[PDB]
Design a protein around this ligand. Structure first.
Ligand SMILES: [Cl-]
Ligand SMILES: [Cl-]
Ligand code: NA
Ligand code: NA
Lengths: 126, 122
């Protein structure tokens, strides 16, 4: 009964033309340890920001899900930093993920919008 | 970043002379999915079978959700285990075993060598 599944969150700051954006790529089944590894970089990225200025891209194309603890870490990060994001582009596949993006958008102050194409997402995002 | 750590639980019935025990090996950082893969096997074993052996030499720990599944399993089934040999290394794992022993109705004892453990286990 063993398993060696690939998972994690990649975080970076990317560029599209003359705009910088915060990029995430969530892969596999996320754990609390994954949120822990990513949190200091996120805190570094948002240092000094107290207004809705940030735009982010979150690629969930290879995301399987979140552990229970990870789901709580995620909500904690949203409660703590979410107001600082004005727009969030979600990149995934299918209508069920589109629907989940619309549900997230209802809950959040920043504008969340779903895409399948990165170039479309970046055009809207920045 | 990315990772692909090995984790899981091996379970099965084993022999020591003309005598049997339930063997567990806990590897890595255990998750809820690991507990769900393992539970139906544990139940079939208990319907068919008590003393057990738990190898923690390669155990890192349990996720929050898994610690809960684990406690749920101990509350349901631990009374059925009269003796539990914990196979591990070091005094921190021994201490953890002694703490577990205090909490539980069966006798839990720490060993470094499987052969020494099986002599006491059955
Ligand atoms: Cl977790
Ligand atoms: Cl879990
Ligand atoms: Na929103
Ligand atoms: Na005990």
């Amino acid at each position: 009964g063993m398993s060696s599944n690939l998972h994690g969150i990649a975080i970076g700051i990317e560029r599209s033309q003359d705009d910088f954006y915060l990029a995430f790529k969530a892969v596999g089944k996320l754990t609390h340890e994954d949120y822990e590894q990513m949190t200091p970089l996120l805190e570094s990225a948002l240092a000094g920001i107290k207004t809705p200025e940030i735009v982010a891209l979150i690629d969930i194309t290879e995301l399987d899900g979140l552990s229970l603890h990870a789901a709580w870490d995620d909500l904690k990060l949203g409660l703590k930093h979410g107001k600082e994001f004005k727009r969030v582009a979600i990149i995934g596949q299918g209508e069920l993920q589109e629907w989940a993006t619309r549900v997230a958008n209802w809950f959040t102050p920043g504008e969340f919008k779903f895409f399948e194409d990165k170039r479309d997402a970046l055009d809207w995002l920045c």
